[PDB]
Amino acid sequence: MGAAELRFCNQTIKELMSKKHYNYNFPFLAPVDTVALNIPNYNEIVKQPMDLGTIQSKLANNEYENADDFEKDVRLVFKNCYLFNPEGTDVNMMGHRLEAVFDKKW
Ligand SMILES: Cc1ccc(Nc2c(-c3ccc(O)cc3)nc3c(C)cccn23)cc1
């Protein structure tokens, strides 16, 4: 990825993970802990799990060849959120509001 595009992806993922947005990013900072959350059906429902911490790692390890691949993974976090968490639930609302932060920056 180009240098300026890489810098912008890094700024974007750090913005999404920052404590400034803790109230709506905390469920998405690390892979879903299906044992701690008692959700064995998460792996049966969500076939391509993704989280912000994994995206940050993939970025640092040169696994996004352009910004579009980076965006696809960010969108996947929210797609999985809306699939597993029904509309109206607390985590679903957090996904909507964090994706709005991404839309504004991106
Ligand atoms: C029985 C049940 C129902 C809903 C949830 N949602 C949920 C998720 C979650 C995040 C992303 C995702 O793609 C799927 C689930 N993260 C949490 C956390 C950190 C605390 C409490 C609930 N949480 C957990 C258990």
Numbering used by the authors: 384 to 489
Please share text taken word for word from the publication where this structure appeared.
BET proteins are chromatin-associated factors that regulate transcription and chromatin remodelling. BET proteins bind chromatin through their two BDs (BD1 and BD2), which specifically recognize histones acetylated on lysine residues. The BDs from C. albicans Bdf1 (CaBdf1) share 31–46% sequence identity with human BET BDs and 58–66% identity with those from ScBdf1 and hence are likely to bind multi-acetylated H3 and H4 tails.
Moreover, no significant inhibition of any human BDs was observed for compound 2 by BROMOscan profiling and by an ITC assay on the two most sensitive BDs identified by this screen (SMARCA2 and SMARCA4); while only mild cytotoxicity was observed towards mammalian cells (EC50 ∼60 μM). The crystal structure of CaBdf1 BD2 bound to 2 reveals that the compound forms a hydrogen bond via its amino group with the conserved Asn468 residue, as well as a cation–pi interaction involving the phenolic ring and the partial positive charge on Asn468. Instead, the compound's imidazolyl and hydroxyl groups form water-mediated hydrogen bonds with backbone atoms of the Phe-Pro-Phe (FPF) shelf (Pro410) and helix B (Val460). Replacement of the hydroxyl group in 2 by a hydrogen (2a) or fluorine (2b) atom severely reduces inhibitory activity, underscoring the importance of this group for high-affinity binding. The methylpyridinyl and phenolic groups are sandwiched between the FPF shelf and gatekeeper residue Val474 on one side, and residues Val415 and Leu420 on the other, while the tolyl group additionally contacts residues Ile422 and Phe467. A structural alignment with Brd4 BD2 shows that larger Brd4 side chains at four of these contact positions, including signature positions 1,3 and 5 (Trp374, Leu387 and His437) and residue Tyr432, reduces the volume available for compound 2, explaining the inability of 2 to inhibit the human BD. In contrast, the poor affinity for CaBdf1 BD1 is due to smaller side chains at signature positions 1 and 3 (Val232 and Val245), resulting in poor complementarity between the binding pocket and ligand. The selectivity of 1 and 2 for CaBdf1 results from steric incompatibility with bulkier side chains in the human BET BD-binding pockets, particularly at signature positions 1 and 3.
